[PDB]
Amino acid sequence: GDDRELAILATAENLLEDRPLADISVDDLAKGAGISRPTFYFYFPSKEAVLLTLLDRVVNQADMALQTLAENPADTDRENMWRTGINVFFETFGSHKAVTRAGQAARATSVEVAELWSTFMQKWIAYTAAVIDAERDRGAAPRTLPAHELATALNLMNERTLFASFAGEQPSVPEARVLDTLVHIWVTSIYGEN
Amino acid sequence: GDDRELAILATAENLLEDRPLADISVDDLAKGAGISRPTFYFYFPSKEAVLLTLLDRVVNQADMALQTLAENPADTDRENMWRTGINVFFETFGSHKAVTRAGQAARATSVEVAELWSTFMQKWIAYTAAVIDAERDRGAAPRTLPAHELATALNLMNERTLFASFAGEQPSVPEARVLDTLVHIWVTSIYGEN
Ligand SMILES: [N-]=[N+]=NCC(=O)N1CCC(c2nc(-c3cccs3)no2)CC1
Ligand SMILES: [N-]=[N+]=NCC(=O)N1CCC(c2nc(-c3cccs3)no2)CC1
């Protein structure tokens, strides 16, 4: 029963590797999950609702990993601190590229998907700004731009850059260079007097 | 004749302020342009082709303005140099918000629109990287990240951040704070040793 929902989710993630949600049928999902097409509809109203659940699980997985870092002290240099945080997102989204990609596209056509992404981006921006404010408070970083504004542009950069890399977009930073690229830009803009 | 094509283009830009391309009909465009619906089809195959032409004109307008800066010496401090260049894009795209917004959305559904955007982004990245290399060559900026990689992430940040601002997205940087935000991040990451 609960195993049937998990089998629907696992099947959808697998097939999204191969083709867009547009070219996946409910029949495909039902067949991969070992249930009938009418039984599918007991668990989800649509293939679009299945993608929303997949995206929700990934975004929460990233959020929980970030909470684990936040809870620790972690004796570290400032560049390494930011690197480990950025790495949470690079690894979580990069381990679920097909779901990431389909999820980003569905933001244009789905109000629920648009809202889910917006909600977590707001949360992740507020935490970034809180960390920058703390750095400023102990005299480790200079009082330059408004911290929330700085944090917003840095996060939108990470969104656009990570996803362009994962999709093999033209133009993009090579996947093997993206972490180093983002970390340099974060560290210089947060600690730089100019 | 050539005035009829320009009237079709002017009408489309105006109506895009009010509503998405989805809710604009060929009848609307033909009526605003003072021609019949069959006469429209002499000039364009579709309302989608009209948007492509509008986007092409805007992107070329930005590109030409950047060329004018490139051609000058312009006796300036380094922060002011980058500011005037970033301002080209903030002002050009920000003077054509409806076309910008519709154009960005059409990248998902139109190969021609996707290609046009990709082509100009590549050009703008290559010029950014050439300027950073020149700065490094005269000893004004440190040899840190590969310049083309640095230039790619900085440009993708500007894309995502400008367009989120213009659309009133949640999250976004206020339109009145976006130029200062981007300039700080560009200057510190290009000139910062760390
Ligand atoms: N795009 N996107 N995803 C969001 C994204 O890329 N982020 C980068 C790291 C940010 C951050 N790291 C940290 C800490 C690291 C170590 C201790 S706290 N605090 O905020 C969280 C959001
Ligand atoms: N997104 N987007 N649009 C692209 C964008 O935002 N750009 C920012 C400025 C870049 C640039 N400026 C300059 C110069 C300024 C002054 C002399 S050269 N050279 O490269 C060009 C591309």
Side-chain angles (χ1 to χ4, degrees):
Chain A
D2 196 60
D3 292 4
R4 277 158 133 186
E5 197 188 311
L6 292 166
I8 293 173
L9 292 161
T11 301
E13 184 157 25
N14 291 151
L15 298 179
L16 282 168
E17 314 295 329
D18 251 43
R19 48 216 169 100
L21 193 67
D23 311 335
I24 301 171
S25 69
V26 178
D27 246 299
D28 293 328
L29 301 170
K31 185 149 210 175
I35 63 180
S36 73
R37 218 183 159 280
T39 293
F40 174 88
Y41 285 106
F42 185 78
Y43 296 101
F44 298 90
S46 59
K47 65 185 182 181
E48 289 79 24
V50 176
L51 177 58
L52 174 69
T53 300
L54 285 169
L55 215 216
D56 184 276
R57 298 269 208 96
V58 178
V59 151
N60 278 288
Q61 185 188 329
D63 193 60
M64 294 181 272
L66 178 63
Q67 282 181 232
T68 298
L69 285 183
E71 287 165 14
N72 307 154
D75 78 89
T76 209
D77 79 65
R78 74 198 186 178
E79 173 174 349
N80 212 62
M81 183 181 70
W82 291 110
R83 177 177 269 120
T84 308
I86 295 168
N87 189 243
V88 169
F89 296 88
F90 175 70
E91 287 293 330
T92 305
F93 300 148
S95 293
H96 301 280
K97 285 182 179 57
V99 164
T100 289
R101 177 166 48 247
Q104 294 302 125
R107 126 274 196 278
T109 61
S110 169
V111 292
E112 300 103 297
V113 173
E115 168 160 354
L116 177 63
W117 190 257
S118 170
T119 299
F120 281 85
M121 288 295 285
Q122 294 172 245
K123 190 182 354 294
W124 296 334
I125 291 160
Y127 190 60
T128 306
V131 178
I132 293 164
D133 279 333
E135 288 293 86
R136 286 162 179 201
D137 282 345
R138 61 182 202 78
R143 302 193 176 271
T144 53
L145 297 175
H148 198 268
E149 299 167 6
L150 174 52
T152 299
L154 290 175
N155 282 287
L156 294 175
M157 170 181 71
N158 286 14
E159 181 193 300
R160 190 66 201 100
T161 306
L162 292 172
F163 303 150
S165 296
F166 295 153
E169 285 184 31
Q170 181 81 292
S172 62
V173 179
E175 181 166 346
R177 291 297 310 145
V178 85
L179 224 204
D180 281 357
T181 304
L182 297 172
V183 169
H184 170 269
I185 295 157
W186 277 60
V187 173
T188 55
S189 71
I190 293 163
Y191 299 97
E193 186 69 73
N194 229 23
Chain B
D2 196 60
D3 292 4
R4 277 158 133 186
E5 197 188 311
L6 292 166
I8 293 173
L9 292 161
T11 301
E13 184 157 25
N14 291 151
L15 298 179
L16 282 168
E17 314 295 329
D18 251 43
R19 48 216 169 100
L21 193 67
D23 311 335
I24 301 171
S25 69
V26 178
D27 246 299
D28 293 328
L29 301 170
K31 185 149 210 175
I35 63 180
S36 73
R37 218 183 159 280
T39 293
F40 174 88
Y41 285 106
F42 185 78
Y43 296 101
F44 298 90
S46 59
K47 65 185 182 181
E48 289 79 24
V50 176
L51 177 58
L52 174 69
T53 300
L54 285 169
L55 215 216
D56 184 276
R57 298 269 208 96
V58 178
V59 151
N60 278 288
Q61 185 188 329
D63 193 60
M64 294 181 272
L66 178 63
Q67 282 181 232
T68 298
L69 285 183
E71 287 165 14
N72 307 154
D75 78 89
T76 209
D77 79 65
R78 74 198 186 178
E79 173 174 349
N80 212 62
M81 183 181 70
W82 291 110
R83 177 177 269 120
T84 308
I86 295 168
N87 189 243
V88 169
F89 296 88
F90 175 70
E91 287 293 330
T92 305
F93 300 148
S95 293
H96 301 280
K97 285 182 179 57
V99 164
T100 289
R101 177 166 48 247
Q104 294 302 125
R107 126 274 196 278
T109 61
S110 169
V111 292
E112 300 103 297
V113 173
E115 168 160 354
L116 177 63
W117 190 257
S118 170
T119 299
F120 281 85
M121 288 295 285
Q122 294 172 245
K123 190 182 354 294
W124 296 334
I125 291 160
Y127 190 60
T128 306
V131 178
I132 293 164
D133 279 333
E135 288 293 86
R136 286 162 179 201
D137 282 345
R138 61 182 202 78
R143 302 193 176 271
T144 53
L145 297 175
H148 198 268
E149 299 167 6
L150 174 52
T152 299
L154 290 175
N155 282 287
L156 294 175
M157 170 181 71
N158 286 14
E159 181 193 300
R160 190 66 201 100
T161 306
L162 292 172
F163 303 150
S165 296
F166 295 153
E169 285 184 31
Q170 181 81 292
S172 62
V173 179
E175 181 166 346
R177 291 297 310 145
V178 85
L179 224 204
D180 281 357
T181 304
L182 297 172
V183 169
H184 170 269
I185 295 157
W186 277 60
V187 173
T188 55
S189 71
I190 293 163
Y191 299 97
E193 186 69 73
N194 229 23

